[PDB]
Amino acid sequence: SKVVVPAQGKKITLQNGKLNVPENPIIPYIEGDGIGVDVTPAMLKVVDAAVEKAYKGERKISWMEIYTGEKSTQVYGQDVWLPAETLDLIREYRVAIKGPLTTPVGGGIRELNVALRQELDLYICLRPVRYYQGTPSPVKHPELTDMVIFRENSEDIYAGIEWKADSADAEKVIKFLREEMGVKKIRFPEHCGIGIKPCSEEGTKRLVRAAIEYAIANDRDSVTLVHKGNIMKFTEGAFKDWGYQLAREEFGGELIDGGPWLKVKNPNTGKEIVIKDVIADAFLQQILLRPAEYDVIACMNLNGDYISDALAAQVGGIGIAPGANIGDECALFEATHGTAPKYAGQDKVNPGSIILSAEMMLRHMGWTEAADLIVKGMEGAINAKTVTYDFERLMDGAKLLKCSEFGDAIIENM
Amino acid sequence: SKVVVPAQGKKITLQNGKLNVPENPIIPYIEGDGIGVDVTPAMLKVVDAAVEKAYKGERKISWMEIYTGEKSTQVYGQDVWLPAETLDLIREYRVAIKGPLTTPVGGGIRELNVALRQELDLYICLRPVRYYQGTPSPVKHPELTDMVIFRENSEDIYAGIEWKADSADAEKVIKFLREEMGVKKIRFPEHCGIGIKPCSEEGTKRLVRAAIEYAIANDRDSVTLVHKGNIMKFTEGAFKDWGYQLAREEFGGELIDGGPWLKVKNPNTGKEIVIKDVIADAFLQQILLRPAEYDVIACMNLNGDYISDALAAQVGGIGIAPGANIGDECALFEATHGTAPKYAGQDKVNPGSIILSAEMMLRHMGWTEAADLIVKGMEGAINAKTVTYDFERLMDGAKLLKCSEFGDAIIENM
Ligand SMILES: NC(=O)c1ccc[n+]([C@@H]2O[C@H](COP(=O)([O-])OP(=O)(O)OC[C@H]3O[C@@H](n4cnc5c(N)ncnc54)[C@H](OP(=O)(O)O)[C@@H]3O)[C@@H](O)[C@H]2O)c1
Ligand SMILES: NC(=O)c1ccc[n+]([C@@H]2O[C@H](COP(=O)([O-])OP(=O)(O)OC[C@H]3O[C@@H](n4cnc5c(N)ncnc54)[C@H](OP(=O)(O)O)[C@@H]3O)[C@@H](O)[C@H]2O)c1
Ligand SMILES: CC(C)[C@H](C(=O)O)[C@@H](O)C(=O)O
Ligand SMILES: CC(C)[C@H](C(=O)O)[C@@H](O)C(=O)O
Ligand SMILES: [Mg+2]
Ligand SMILES: [Mg+2]
Numbered sequence: 001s002k003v004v005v006p007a008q009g010k011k012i013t014l015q016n017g018k019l020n021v022p023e024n025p026i027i028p029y030i031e032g033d034g035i036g037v038d039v040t041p042a043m044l045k046v047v048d049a050a051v052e053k054a055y056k057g058e059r060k061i062s063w064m065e066i067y068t069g070e071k072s073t074q075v076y077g078q079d080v081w082l083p084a085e086t087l088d089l090i091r092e093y094r095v096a097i098k099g100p101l102t103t104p105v106g107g108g109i110r111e112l113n114v115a116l117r118q119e120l121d122l123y124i125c126l127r128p129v130r131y132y133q134g135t136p137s138p139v140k141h142p143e144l145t146d147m148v149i150f151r152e153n154s155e156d157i158y159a160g161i162e163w164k165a166d167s168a169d170a171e172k173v174i175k176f177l178r179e180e181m182g183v184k185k186i187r188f189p190e191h192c193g194i195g196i197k198p199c200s201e202e203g204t205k206r207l208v209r210a211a212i213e214y215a216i217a218n219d220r221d222s223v224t225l226v227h228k229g230n231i232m233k234f235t236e237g238a239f240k241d242w243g244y245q246l247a248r249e250e251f252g253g254e255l256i257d258g259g260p261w262l263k264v265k266n267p268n269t270g271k272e273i274v275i276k277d278v279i280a281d282a283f284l285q286q287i288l289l290r291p292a293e294y295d296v297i298a299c300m301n302l303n304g305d306y307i308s309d310a311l312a313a314q315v316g317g318i319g320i321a322p323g324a325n326i327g328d329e330c331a332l333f334e335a336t337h338g339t340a341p342k343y344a345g346q347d348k349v350n351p352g353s354i355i356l357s358a359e360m361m362l363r364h365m366g367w368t369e370a371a372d373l374i375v376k377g378m379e380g381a382i383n384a385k386t387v388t389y390d391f392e393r394l395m396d397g398a399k400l401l402k403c404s405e406f407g408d409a410i411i412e413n414m
Numbered sequence: 415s416k417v418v419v420p421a422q423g424k425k426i427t428l429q430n431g432k433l434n435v436p437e438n439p440i441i442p443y444i445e446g447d448g449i450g451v452d453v454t455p456a457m458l459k460v461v462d463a464a465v466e467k468a469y470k471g472e473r474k475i476s477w478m479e480i481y482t483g484e485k486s487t488q489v490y491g492q493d494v495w496l497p498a499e500t501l502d503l504i505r506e507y508r509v510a511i512k513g514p515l516t517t518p519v520g521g522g523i524r525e526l527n528v529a530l531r532q533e534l535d536l537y538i539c540l541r542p543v544r545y546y547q548g549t550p551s552p553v554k555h556p557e558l559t560d561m562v563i564f565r566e567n568s569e570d571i572y573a574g575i576e577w578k579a580d581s582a583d584a585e586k587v588i589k590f591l592r593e594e595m596g597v598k599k600i601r602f603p604e605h606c607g608i609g610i611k612p613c614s615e616e617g618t619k620r621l622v623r624a625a626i627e628y629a630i631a632n633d634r635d636s637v638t639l640v641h642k643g644n645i646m647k648f649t650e651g652a653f654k655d656w657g658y659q660l661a662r663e664e665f666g667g668e669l670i671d672g673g674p675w676l677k678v679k680n681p682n683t684g685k686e687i688v689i690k691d692v693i694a695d696a697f698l699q700q701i702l703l704r705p706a707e708y709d710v711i712a713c714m715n716l717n718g719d720y721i722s723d724a725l726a727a728q729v730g731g732i733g734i735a736p737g738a739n740i741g742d743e744c745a746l747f748e749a750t751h752g753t754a755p756k757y758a759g760q761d762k763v764n765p766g767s768i769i770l771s772a773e774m775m776l777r778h779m780g781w782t783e784a785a786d787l788i789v790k791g792m793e794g795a796i797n798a799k800t801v802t803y804d805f806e807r808l809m810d811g812a813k814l815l816k817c818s819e820f821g822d823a824i825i826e827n828m
Contacts (some may be wrong), residue, residue: 043488103644111645138702139552140808154563157611159599161591162648165615169595176590177575177610179681181583185573187532188614193648195611196591197571200602201579227715230517231525234584234607282752283697285727288552289807302642305695310724313699313729338696393703394554 001085002067002075009062010114012094012365014329020093021365023055026062028089032099033069034339035349040099042407043349047358049411054369066090067102069112081109087119092377097361099354100339110160115334117153122325124210125151125301126360127308127336134383135158135316136394142315144291148220149311150211151304152239153325155203158301161196187337198236199300208243210326211298212251215273216266223247223264224300226283227326239300240277247275270335287311302343308336319350319390322357324364331364333357349404350388352378373414380413381406381411416481416489423476426508426779428743433508435583435779437469442478442503446513447483448753449763454513456765456821458786461772463825468783480504483515483526495523501533505823508744511775513768514753524574530746531567536739537617538624539565539715540774541722541750548797549730550808556729558705562723564625566653567739569617572715575610584608613649613714615656622657622742625712626665629687630680636688637661637678640697640713640721653714654691660690698734701725722750733764733804736771738778745778746769761817764802766792769824787828794827795820 009026033038051059066086069073076083090096101112127149131142163170173194177183215223229237247253253262253275262275280303312321321336335353343349362371385398386409392400401409445454465473480500481489490497504510515526541563545556577584581823587608591597629637643651661667667676667689676689694717726735735750749767757763776785799812800823806814815823
């Protein structure tokens with residue numbers, strides 16, 4: 001192993017489903033491909049500053065670099081794109097953060113980001129989207145956007161079950177469907193690629209459960225199940241039916257009017273939480289035309305991937321869109337954006353995304369004060385109109401800052 | 415049959431792939447469920463007016479009502495949701511228009527809208543989205559949005575191949591995948607619904623071919639292949655690879671830089687058309703942050719469904735979003751919106767969508783003058799700020815008009 005365990009740090013433990021965070025926790029991190037080389041260093045500095053200022057030296061993170069992707073090949077050798085120790089370490093230290101990752105073409109290499117999520121069973125993809133005062137947005141009222149996406153992270157089409165057109169496997173599968181299952185619906189069975197889409201009751205319910213619990217835990221107004229159930233009855237439709245069923249069976253969901261919407265009483269604030277659903281295509285117009293009407297979103301893997309980007313663009317873009325992959329044993333924080341090789345190495349991209357993901361990590365560890373300083377700094381720097389390229393557009397009088405520069409601006413406004 | 419063939423009309427014929435439209439063409443039409451009862455009458459009046467004014471009485475449409483959905487059951491009896499004659503008539507008269515349709519819950523009834531498209535093999539779902547001066551939009555520069563969506567209409571997950579969780583079929587399919595195909599990727603094989611996603615070379619290429627030909631025919635700047643190929647390699651990825659391949663093999667697509675983008679020279683205007691591609695999630699941010707950079711869009715069934723609504727909301731909403739289902743033998747025009755039973759029968763919804771779909775129909779028949787009068791009227795009425803509920807929002811000084819009222823406003827501005 002080429003990983004070096006920090007000497008002055010201590011491992012975080014999980015006792016009774018509750019995190020036990022030391023004052024010197026060891027936090028593993030993956031630099032990331034492309035721009036990850038730009039944003040990650042900015043994140044480490046901003047986090048260290050937030051922690052240093054919040055607890056005046058009482059607390060401190062012991063960063064431990066781990067590898068995945070290109071750098072892993074440089075470190076562990078050719079073909080070692082995702083070392084087993086990397087998965088071992090994330091699960092063992094409970095909390096980790098990663099920069100963007102890119103999977104090479106071919107080589108029989110599976111998508112590295114999806115591999116991490118699925119190998120660690122981090123079934124929740126949590127992506128909160130809200131507006132930051134001063135952020136240049138293409139819409140008229142970005143302030144109306146304040147939602148939290150709970151995207152199922154372990155099934156759907158992301159299962160990776162598919163076969164190439166004209167391949168022996170594809171023909172074998174197509175032969176079984178037409179001959180044994182009597183399927184006559186394939187328009188062109190020749191030179192036809194095939195993909196499988198699974199959706200289970202347990203996969204659906206553990207995701208929705210987390211979404212409702214988060215709504216209750218943070219006193220949100222509603223949980224909206226987004227699906228395309230009118231066309232995919234047994235997968236997307238099942239997801240919606242299972243979600244409503246869980247709200248009734250586990251949260252005392254009560255019929256609103258003649259339904260289908262339910263109301264769940266917040267055990268804490270006594271507030272009634274609305275449980276509704278919207279068809280995916282229609283939802284894409286709704287978030288733009290009636291944003292204020294939506295809060296927490298529970299949806300399947302693919303739909304969540306699309307909604308994440310559509311919402312982010314509403315409040316400034318993917319440069320300010322954080323996220324987290326959460327499971328029962330550990331959590332891996334990461335920004336919604338990619339490696340943008342186009343800008344890679346230029347120290348020009350917006351580090352806000354990975355930084356706000358670190359803010360989620362801090363909150364997750366219970367270091368809410370350090371988390372609050374990051375939000376304060378971010379809001380201060382953006383308001384000071386000292387921002388990165390992606391914000392400069394739709395920004396008159398804004399001063400352009402380099403990636404590392406913006407990080408410093410955040411610390412300056414803490 | 416309860417259908418009455420117009421006495422003074424004549425059937426449109428297709429000779430050499432070219433439509434032969436008489437001056438008194440018989441045009442079949444489906445009223446539609448819900449609000450279809452409101453918008454359809456407005457459309458017939460507006461179209462009749464546009465035609466009457468453009469050709470001063472020389473030309474006239476002979477409307478012939480045909481049935482599908484609820485009204486079909488009223489006419490032909492219980493269980494007759496989609497009469498065979500309806501499909502026969504659309505194919506025979508070549509050009510038809512329909513209001514929104516809703517499929518009942520259960521009854522073993524398949525989605526009626528998809529049934530029409532697939533039974534008639536109308537593989538192209540053409541949905542143009544552009545801004546109309548004076549239209550209240552949630553974005554800052556709706557005028558930058560001017561795109562044309564070419565959505566594959568015959569395959570993808572819309573094939574309707576799926577099995578219910580815990581069903582014998584589902585278990586049989588899951589057993590085959592795990593046992594015979596050795597699939598170990600299903601996270602939860604129990605209580606698991608299964609759906610099949612097919613994508614063929616012929617289905618992909620006939621759609622992309624139509625998109626490029628439209629770009630050439632209308633001198634558009636580019637064709638963008640939208641896909642989620644990084645995750646669905648053999649379906650969405652195949653679609654993108656097949657699209658690029660066709661541009662090269664059939665349109666002399668030439669490498670731009672080191673690729674992957676291609677350039678196709680417009681045989682007519684000598685202009686070079688750009689053939690590029692964008693990942694679906696990223697594309698949803700791109701249309702909002704860099705609209706001007708996109709023109710004609712070629713995408714798969716599901717992706718097209720989502721993009722249609724996301725784009726429409728950008729220029730006023732689904733109340734002003736037309737569309738057409740085009741095949742090799744016939745075409746069925748229809749708005750992107752649904753039956754909105756919530757507002758149904760209230761004569762309050764925006765008829766602009768089905769009316770602009772009729773404008774597409776007229777253009778399709780070569781009656782471009784009548785089509786131009788509809789655009790003129792629409793632009794005039796909206797500019798006069800005499801609009802329907804959906805526009806009134808984000809409209810100060812706008813006067814609210816009833817559905818039928820707005821139709822009259824259009825005719826008044828022709
Ligand atoms: N979880 C992940 O690690 C992850 C996520 C997404 C994609 N990927 C991968 O990364 C590679 C490139 O993919 P892509 O180009 O489709 O996606 P991407 O890297 O997110 O790039 C898409 C566009 O979004 C914007 N963007 C991304 N990061 C930004 C930042 N830090 N600050 C400001 N704007 C930012 C830019 O838009 P403008 O150019 O309009 O400014 C950018 O060109 C692929 O190999 C892909 O699989 C990985
Ligand atoms: N091709 C079709 O015939 C078609 C298309 C889509 C859906 N459907 C079906 O119709 C039913 C209802 O579905 P849905 O509620 O998901 O979709 P929908 O009927 O399109 O309604 C969605 C929302 O979009 C807006 N809208 C729709 N038509 C409008 C119009 N003419 N003018 C102004 N705004 C309009 C309204 O938004 P606000 O309430 O925010 O104003 C409406 O409540 C279902 O049975 C569904 O399967 C059929
Ligand atoms: C890179 C890709 C596999 C990934 C996904 O589709 O989830 C990305 O788009 C993201 O949102 O993290
Ligand atoms: C009603 C539904 C089957 C249809 C589709 O998904 O294409 C609708 O959303 C539309 O866009 O016409
Ligand atoms: Mg994404
Ligand atoms: Mg739709």
